[PDB]
Amino acid sequence: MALSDTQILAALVVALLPAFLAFRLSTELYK
Amino acid sequence: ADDFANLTPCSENPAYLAKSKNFLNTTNDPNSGKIRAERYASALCGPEGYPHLIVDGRFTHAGDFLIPSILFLYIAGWIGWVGRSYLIEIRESKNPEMQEVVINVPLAIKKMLGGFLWPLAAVGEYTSGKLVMKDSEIPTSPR
Amino acid sequence: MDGSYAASYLPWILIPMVGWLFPAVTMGLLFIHIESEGEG
Amino acid sequence: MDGLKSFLSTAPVMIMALLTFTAGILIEFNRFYPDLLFHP
Amino acid sequence: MTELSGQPPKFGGSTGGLLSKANREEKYAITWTSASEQVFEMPTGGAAIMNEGENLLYLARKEQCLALGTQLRTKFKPKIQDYKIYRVYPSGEVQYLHPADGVFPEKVNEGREAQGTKTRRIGQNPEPVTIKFSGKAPYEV
Amino acid sequence: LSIVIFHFSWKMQSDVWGTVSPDGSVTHVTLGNFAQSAITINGWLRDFLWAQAANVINSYGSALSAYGIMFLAGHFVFAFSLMFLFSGRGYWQELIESIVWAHNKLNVAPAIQPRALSIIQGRAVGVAHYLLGGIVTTWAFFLARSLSIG
Amino acid sequence: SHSVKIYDTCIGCTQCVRACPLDVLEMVPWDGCKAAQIASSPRTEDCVGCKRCETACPTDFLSIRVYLGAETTRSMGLAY
Amino acid sequence: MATKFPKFSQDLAQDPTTRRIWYGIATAHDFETHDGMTEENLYQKIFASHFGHIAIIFLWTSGTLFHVAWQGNFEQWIKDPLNIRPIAHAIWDPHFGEGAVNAFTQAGASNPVNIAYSGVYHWFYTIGMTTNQELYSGAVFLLVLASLFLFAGWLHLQPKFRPSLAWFKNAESRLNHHLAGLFGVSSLAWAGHLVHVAIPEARGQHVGWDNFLSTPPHPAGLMPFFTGNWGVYAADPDTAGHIFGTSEGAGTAILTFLGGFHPQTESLWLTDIAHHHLAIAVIFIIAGHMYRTNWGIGHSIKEILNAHKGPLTGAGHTNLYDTINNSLHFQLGLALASLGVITSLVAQHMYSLPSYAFIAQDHTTQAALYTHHQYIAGFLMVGAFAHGAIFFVRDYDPVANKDNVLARMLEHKEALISHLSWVSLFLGFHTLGLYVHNDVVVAFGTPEKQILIEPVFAQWIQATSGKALYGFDVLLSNPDSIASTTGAAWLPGWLDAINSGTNSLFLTIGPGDFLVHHAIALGLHTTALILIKGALDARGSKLMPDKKDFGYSFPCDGPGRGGTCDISAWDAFYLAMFWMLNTLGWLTFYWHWKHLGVWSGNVAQFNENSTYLMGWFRDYLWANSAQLINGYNPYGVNNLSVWAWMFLFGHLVWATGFMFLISWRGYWQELIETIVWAHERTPLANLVRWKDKPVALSIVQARLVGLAHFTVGYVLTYAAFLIASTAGKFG
Numbered sequence A: 001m002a003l004s005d006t007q008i009l010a011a012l013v014v015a016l017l018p019a020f021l022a023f024r025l026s027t028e029l030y031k
Numbered sequence B: 001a002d003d004f005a006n007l008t009p010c011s012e013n014p015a016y017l018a019k020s021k022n023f024l025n026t027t028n029d030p031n032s033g034k035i036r037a038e039r040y041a042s043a044l045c046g047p048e049g050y051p052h053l054i055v056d057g058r059f060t061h062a063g064d065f066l067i068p069s070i071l072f073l074y075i076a077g078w079i080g081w082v083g084r085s086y087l088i089e090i091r092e093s094k095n096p097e098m099q100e101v102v103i104n105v106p107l108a109i110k111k112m113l114g115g116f117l118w119p120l121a122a123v124g125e126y127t128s129g130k131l132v133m134k135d136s137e138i139p140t141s142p143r
Numbered sequence C: 001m002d003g004s005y006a007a008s009y010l011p012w013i014l015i016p017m018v019g020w021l022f023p024a025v026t027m028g029l030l031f032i033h034i035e036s037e038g039e040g
Numbered sequence D: 001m002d003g004l005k006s007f008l009s010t011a012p013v014m015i016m017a018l019l020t021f022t023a024g025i026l027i028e029f030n031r032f033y034p035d036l037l038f039h040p
Numbered sequence E: 001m002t003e004l005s006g007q008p009p010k011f012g013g014s015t016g017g018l019l020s021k022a023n024r025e026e027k028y029a030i031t032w033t034s035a036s037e038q039v040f041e042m043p044t045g046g047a048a049i050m051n052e053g054e055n056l057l058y059l060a061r062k063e064q065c066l067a068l069g070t071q072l073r074t075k076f077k078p079k080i081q082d083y084k085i086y087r088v089y090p091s092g093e094v095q096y097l098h099p100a101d102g103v104f105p106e107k108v109n110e111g112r113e114a115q116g117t118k119t120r121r122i123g124q125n126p127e128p129v130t131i132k133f134s135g136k137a138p139y140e141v
Numbered sequence F: 001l002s003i004v005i006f007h008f009s010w011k012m013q014s015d016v017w018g019t020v021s022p023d024g025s026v027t028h029v030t031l032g033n034f035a036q037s038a039i040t041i042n043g044w045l046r047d048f049l050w051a052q053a054a055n056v057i058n059s060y061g062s063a064l065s066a067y068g069i070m071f072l073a074g075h076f077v078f079a080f081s082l083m084f085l086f087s088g089r090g091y092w093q094e095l096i097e098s099i100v101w102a103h104n105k106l107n108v109a110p111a112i113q114p115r116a117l118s119i120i121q122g123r124a125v126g127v128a129h130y131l132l133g134g135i136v137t138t139w140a141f142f143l144a145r146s147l148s149i150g
Numbered sequence G: 001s002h003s004v005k006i007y008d009t010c011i012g013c014t015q016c017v018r019a020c021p022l023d024v025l026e027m028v029p030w031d032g033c034k035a036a037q038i039a040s041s042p043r044t045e046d047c048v049g050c051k052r053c054e055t056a057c058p059t060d061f062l063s064i065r066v067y068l069g070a071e072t073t074r075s076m077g078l079a080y
Numbered sequence H: 001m002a003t004k005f006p007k008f009s010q011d012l013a014q015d016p017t018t019r020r021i022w023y024g025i026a027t028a029h030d031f032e033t034h035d036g037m038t039e040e041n042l043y044q045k046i047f048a049s050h051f052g053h054i055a056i057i058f059l060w061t062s063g064t065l066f067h068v069a070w071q072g073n074f075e076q077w078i079k080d081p082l083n084i085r086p087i088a089h090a091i092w093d094p095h096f097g098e099g100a101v102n103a104f105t106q107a108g109a110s111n112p113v114n115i116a117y118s119g120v121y122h123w124f125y126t127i128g129m130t131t132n133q134e135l136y137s138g139a140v141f142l143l144v145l146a147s148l149f150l151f152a153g154w155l156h157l158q159p160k161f162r163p164s165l166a167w168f169k170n171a172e173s174r175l176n177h178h179l180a181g182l183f184g185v186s187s188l189a190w191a192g193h194l195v196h197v198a199i200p201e202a203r204g205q206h207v208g209w210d211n212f213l214s215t216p217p218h219p220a221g222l223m224p225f226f227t228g229n230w231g232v233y234a235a236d237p238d239t240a241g242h243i244f245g246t247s248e249g250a251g252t253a254i255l256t257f258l259g260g261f262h263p264q265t266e267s268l269w270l271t272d273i274a275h276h277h278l279a280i281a282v283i284f285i286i287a288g289h290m291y292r293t294n295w296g297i298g299h300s301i302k303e304i305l306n307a308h309k310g311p312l313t314g315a316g317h318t319n320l321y322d323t324i325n326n327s328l329h330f331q332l333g334l335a336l337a338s339l340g341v342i343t344s345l346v347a348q349h350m351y352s353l354p355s356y357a358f359i360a361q362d363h364t365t366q367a368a369l370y371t372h373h374q375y376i377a378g379f380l381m382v383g384a385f386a387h388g389a390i391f392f393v394r395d396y397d398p399v400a401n402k403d404n405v406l407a408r409m410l411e412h413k414e415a416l417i418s419h420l421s422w423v424s425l426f427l428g429f430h431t432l433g434l435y436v437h438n439d440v441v442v443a444f445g446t447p448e449k450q451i452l453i454e455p456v457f458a459q460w461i462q463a464t465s466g467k468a469l470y471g472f473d474v475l476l477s478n479p480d481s482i483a484s485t486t487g488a489a490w491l492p493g494w495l496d497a498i499n500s501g502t503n504s505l506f507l508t509i510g511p512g513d514f515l516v517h518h519a520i521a522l523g524l525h526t527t528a529l530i531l532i533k534g535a536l537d538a539r540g541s542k543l544m545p546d547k548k549d550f551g552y553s554f555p556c557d558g559p560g561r562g563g564t565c566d567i568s569a570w571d572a573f574y575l576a577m578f579w580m581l582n583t584l585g586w587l588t589f590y591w592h593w594k595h596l597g598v599w600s601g602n603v604a605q606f607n608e609n610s611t612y613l614m615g616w617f618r619d620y621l622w623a624n625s626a627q628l629i630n631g632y633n634p635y636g637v638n639n640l641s642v643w644a645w646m647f648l649f650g651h652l653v654w655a656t657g658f659m660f661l662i663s664w665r666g667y668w669q670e671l672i673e674t675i676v677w678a679h680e681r682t683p684l685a686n687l688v689r690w691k692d693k694p695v696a697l698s699i700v701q702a703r704l705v706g707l708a709h710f711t712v713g714y715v716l717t718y719a720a721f722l723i724a725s726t727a728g729k730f731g
């Protein structure tokens, strides 16, 4: 069957994690 | 063995035998098209009707590549050898550059007419040591 | 009909957002680093 | 005089005379025996 | 230095002169004496008439002043060798530039320090593998 | 002038030139599409270039074959100019250094020391070949196209 | 600012100073050549890097070298 | 005056003009040139960059999975993979009108959508992923893996977890771990996955994370692995009548070696791929036990290098360990070279030995993947050379590598460059002469005089592997060679796959292939010549014997000494980029035209027109553009309209680069000064003062921007042609 609607919303909440960790690594690399 | 099985001689090729009856005339001779039909009918052909040449080194097609290769190399060695010898001859006359710009015809012709023995002259200059130079005596750039 | 996929109210906001987000911030960042200046 | 014999023997005049002579050779040879894709 | 005395040259104004940054940041002035009243080309454009005697002109950068100086002594029979180039600050601070020690930098002169002088050949510069990770260049050492 | 001559060549073929019927009607070559197709770059790319260039590439085997030959030849010279227009002589002199070493290895170096073209001459050869290739291409194209309209 | 150096191969001919258009280069008395002088670069702050000195050098390869560096308002040749 | 942009280089910060911005960006990743950068902080910043980059790659793959499982017709395409066009992603453009709306509502989707041409549907259905939920689970797993690597980088940037410089400079352990684990264990685990999921899924058996612990991939378990007899896994292989995804014609074998092509999917066999990965995993694990570590037994690379000397090479490879181990540019130049060669190899292998089911039939995906990988490799090789030039500029030590094989390359660099020039002339002259001769001979109504050279040396190699269309009777083409009577299990499949006139496995070549191959040889020799003269003469020459003191990339040296334009080792890279792009244009024209001939069954067109250039200019460029330029017309708009727009767009960018490449700076500096005066005198505008003093683009930046526009207009235009002209006659 196709993909659910709430799982697409679960995708952004999980994608919050790589964004945040990449922000941390980015600010750590600026030094 | 059956080398070049996908190639049939122009004498047997279908499209070639179809096109050979309708060959154009290059020079003023009207037979030149039929002359080509009779002349190229000996080479190997492809399924399209155009002759092919095999240069892998076999003597069956020594007229395809071997003869022009040798004839070129002869004439080209002639050219380069008379040029090199005339360039060396200039290096002892007045102004080595002016005579490179203005040609000494009585000298350039004398060196051109003595170029048909350029292999023997080159081997005699290599055995004596005139053909090549020494690395420790050539201007080089910083490494 | 635009959105034959699940959660069709996301692609909308996602396209405008990237529209007025990333290059806006990018062009503003260079500006801000030009701001420190130095009157001596 | 030699002033014109030196001009007729300059680099461009001679390099065009040789090219004209070689053109004549090649053109006449491919007039009398044209279409030599290889050697028979 | 103390005062910049000089008459402004006869010129009908041009758009190639100094600008707002050239007045607020820094501008350059050149003072010279003319033996008579003649016409000279402007480094910014056009042809102007220099006044008889002490002259004064303000320009944007230093190269313009030196380009006018190299023109003054070469084109006119009463050659001008007393042209003095000054740099002007936004606080009125004026300092001497060209000529440096009163003598043109062309010919030698006593009382100058060796600046940028090296005691080697260019083919004797050190290898960049020996100075890497250090804030120095093969020519700075 | 590249746009001027194309404006001329397409407006004439579309809204002017054309065969006239014995009744009085006039049917233009490109069927009068200039007023309706020359307004977009794709119109000039397709209905002008791609459409009217067919006479030049299909000219082999006829009396107009020389025009296709010169079309490709101008396409060649155009690109040949880019080598000069995009590079600088400092690389070519360093290469001539290696070739001079090679010539002195067999002791065949001219007393006239070879030097790459000056910067100005590099630019001059570049622009000369650019114009030559472009104008040869357009000349061949225009002649092969105009001779093939009856 | 650009860096200007002068090497011991200099013959002291003042040509690089006669070609300099910004009074960057001078001449100081030396003890290496017949002219007993060597090129000097005290006012590197006025050096734009037009290489007019290096063009006017006679020795086998340059005796004066210019190495471009951190460009400033004066080195960029800004007149506006 | 200095401000704060950038914070890693004071020289670029002190610039009071607009250049301060530009060089602040183009020196972002040049860590070696930062202020006070030490050798350890360098490697550590680079390590964290590696972590972040692995995370970026995994995030891109996660998005690729997400859009397929979300907006793609994966399940439908599984039903009819030879007639249903795959779906890449859905369109959300508020600018469409009516033609594009009616057109892009395609591929079974009820909305304007974009067809997929990256060939990922075939990969996913060949793996065993048959439902969108498996793709979604994989996407979530990759979204977690990327965060894993991001946190790994962030944590290793901490001083307690900061790896030591001696840890980074460890070569005898990094190799033993990358081969036995990153290459061996990875290949072994992938083979296990192929056996446990792919093979059962090919037989209708669903094996997921909910039953793989109990369902064996073979009727006989792990005990027959321990049995010295292994023929039981050859078992009954999948018959020639096997059908993918069903248990019809399926056997019980998992590790075979019968070779050939699957007659239905026209691809490789799954058991063969798993067996291959198992064998090479054993090989790589064995390789991972060569260099010594903390247990004495093992090799030392520094000894092996310094021990291979030579009577004609002097010092051989001495001190090369301490040389390469300390030069990051050396390592990067070797890595880029090897990776580019294997990328070109991947390209040159996937088009004739496809491993994914029903991927050979889709012509647009297969035409796109090959060209994609070839352009990738064409950038990788230029990088390998550009970094070798930087090794010579920054890391070459003439006392450490004294008299070794590396210094002798510099000692005879004139001869190397000279012979490269000779062979490039010897190629170019005759290849161009033969092409022009064929054109002149065909234009005169005499097609019976074309110099058509038969590629004997390559057709004979084809015969050495089983190609009988030429009939050389050599090695595998001869039934009596001892190479055929070896009882090899793969021979019957290989011999059937090679000679069937339906596949791309060793295509029949002729004189056109010969001439285009010699044009390709010219494109390789000349590009390598440029990239090698740029690297050798990167430390000095006779025009600039002190080039080493000026670094790698610098504008020039001045108009003196005759002229010094484009004299740095960076300018040689800038020049060789054009040659790489030209070679990759020639190669792609060759591939696309011959594959059009093979796909339409009209190999005669290519074999009979590729000998003269007009055939390319007409029967390929002009002929295959008809649909391309007809994407949007005054009569309608079809699905090719976006490609018809991108074609002209690429032309525009490519022509824009010509401005930066032909006109140079000073003109633009004067034209900018005029505008500065214009603004500082305009009322209601001089009160709008600028902090950044506007300046014209530098010469280096000029060449860089021009080359970038050229490359964009070179890639995008040819891609809009290659995809549009392919998705019409066959898509």
Ligand code: CLA
Binding pocket: B079, B080, B081, B082, B083, B084, B086, B087, B103, B108, B109, B111, B112, F098, F099, F102, F103, F106, F108, H418, H419, H421, H422, H425
């Ligand atoms: C006496 C003339 C002469 C001789 C003996 C040579 C010999 C050689 N050249 Mg050379 N060359 C010449 C003139 C000559 N050149 C001229 C005039 C040019 C400027 C166009 C060049 C430019 C050139 C390049 C760029 C290169 C060579 C190279 C080479 C070497 C390899 C051969 C080759 O590349 O194939 C053939 C050579 C060419 C196609 C170059 C053109 C040859 C000219 C047109 C022939 C000269 C004829 C001369 C006027 C005869 C004078 C007769 C006298 C009685 C008046 C070789 C030893 C290559 C090298 O470096 O070595 C590996 C190489 O890269 N040459």
Ligand code: CLA
Binding pocket: F076, F077, F078, F079, F080, F081, F082, F083, F084, F086, F087, H421, H424, H425, H426, H427, H428, H429, H432, H522, H526, H529, H530, H575, H576, H578, H579
């Ligand atoms: C169609 C455009 C074009 C052409 C024809 C060439 C041709 C060439 N390039 Mg080149 N290049 C180009 C574009 C082009 N480039 C561009 C855009 C760039 C980026 C700026 C480069 C950058 C580049 C670099 C960096 C290098 C080259 C080199 C070369 C030479 C390699 C030698 C060879 O190929 O053998 C044979 C030569 C040819 C096939 C061309 C000669 C064709 C003529 C017609 C032959 C006959 C002579 C003719 C009759 C003369 C009489 C004229 C008369 C009518 C007045 C060659 C002459 C390399 C080099 O110098 O070689 C050592 C080199 O390093 N190129």
Ligand SMILES: CCCCCCCCCCCCCCCC(=O)OC[C@H](COP(=O)(O)OC[C@@H](O)CO)OC(=O)CCCCCCCCCCCCCCC
Binding pocket: H308, H309, H310, H311, H312, H313, H314, H315, H316, H317, H405
């Ligand atoms: C390129 C496409 C096909 C074109 C024709 C091939 C020629 C290519 C041009 C190269 C010219 C070689 C000039 C030699 C220059 C030369 O004479 O050097 C001299 C050298 C003598 O070395 P020594 O005996 O001192 O060796 C001691 C070593 O320890 C080195 O320190 O002889 C050779 O190296 C012979 C092998 C050539 C090695 C160079 C190329 C090798 C080709 C690739 C080999 C692959 C083998 C398998 C690897 C996986």
Ligand SMILES: CC1=C(/C=C/C(C)=C/C=C/C(C)=C\C=C/C=C(C)\C=C\C=C(C)\C=C\C2=C(C)C[C@H](O)CC2(C)C)C(C)(C)C[C@@H](O)C1
Binding pocket: B055, B056, B057, B058, B065, B076, B077, B078, B079, B080, B081, B082, B084, B122, F106, F108
């Ligand atoms: C077997 C043969 C071919 C195969 C050919 C083989 C593979 C080619 C081998 C080439 C070898 C590697 C090179 C040969 C010689 C290399 C030496 C260094 C030649 C040096 C020539 C120089 C010294 C000559 C100099 C001066 C000579 C003497 C005369 C000139 O005027 C002027 C000038 C150039 C100054 C193939 C391609 C397979 C086709 C087949 O049908 C026939």
Ligand SMILES: CC1=C(/C=C/C(C)=C\C=C\C(C)=C/C=C/C=C(C)/C=C/C=C(C)/C=C/C2=C(C)C(=O)CCC2(C)C)C(C)(C)CCC1
Binding pocket: H061, H065, H134, H135, H137, H138, H139, H141, H142, H189
């Ligand atoms: C305790 C243990 C045992 C039992 C182990 C059991 C019971 C399970 C073991 C599983 C193991 C050990 C490894 C499993 C690894 C699975 C991996 C590594 C999957 C990696 C996926 C990657 C990397 C990315 C895949 C991708 C995705 C997500 C996509 O969707 C697109 C394609 C691609 C990008 C490839 C035994 C006794 C047996 C041996 C001793 C140790």
Ligand SMILES: CC1=C(/C=C/C(C)=C/C=CC(/C)=C/C=C/C=C(C)/C=C/C=C(C)/C=C/C2=C(C)CCCC2(C)C)C(C)(C)CCC1
Binding pocket: H329, H330, H333, H334, H337, H338, H341, H384, H385, H387, H388, H389, H391, H392, H535
């Ligand atoms: C600049 C520089 C550099 C360089 C780099 C490079 C350039 C690399 C590369 C490379 C490459 C690019 C290579 C290639 C190659 C080739 C090869 C390696 C080959 C081969 C062969 C073989 C071995 C084969 C065999 C066989 C056959 C014949 C077929 C069948 C199979 C068999 C196997 C049998 C460096 C950084 C180092 C340093 C600095 C300087």
Ligand SMILES: CC1=C(C/C=C(\C)CCC[C@H](C)CCC[C@H](C)CCCC(C)C)C(=O)c2ccccc2C1=O
Binding pocket: D015, F083, F084, F085, F087, F088, F089, F092, F115, F116, F117, F118, F119, F121, F122, F123
């Ligand atoms: C190739 C190249 C060179 C080298 C160019 C050279 C050496 C010119 C070669 C001329 C040869 C020697 C003569 C051949 C051309 C003749 C003018 C044609 C006359 C033919 C008649 C005799 C029939 C530069 O000097 C240069 C300078 C600045 C930017 C780019 C470049 C550049 O790209």
Ligand SMILES: CC1=C(C/C=C(\C)CCC[C@H](C)CCC[C@H](C)CCCC(C)C)C(=O)c2ccccc2C1=O
Binding pocket: H659, H660, H661, H663, H664, H665, H666, H668, H669, H695, H696, H697, H698, H699, H702
């Ligand atoms: C036009 C031109 C200029 C002038 C160019 C200028 C002043 C640049 C103006 C471009 C502005 C900044 C807009 C560019 C828009 C870009 C697409 C933005 C990209 C920047 C990224 C951060 C996104 C040169 O300075 C020059 C120098 C040397 C050779 C040729 C030329 C040349 O052709």
Ligand code: SF4
Binding pocket: G004, G019, G020, G021, G022, G024, G025, G046, G047, G048, G049, G050, G051, G052, G053, G054, G066
């Ligand atoms: S580089 Fe130019 S401006 Fe600088 S000192 Fe030399 S000549 Fe004068």
Ligand SMILES: [Ca+2]
Binding pocket: H128, H129, H130, H134, H201, H206, H207, H208
């Ligand atoms: Ca499954």
Ligand SMILES: [Cl-]
Binding pocket: F037, F040, F041, F042, F043, F044, H632, H633, H634
């Ligand atoms: Cl249109």
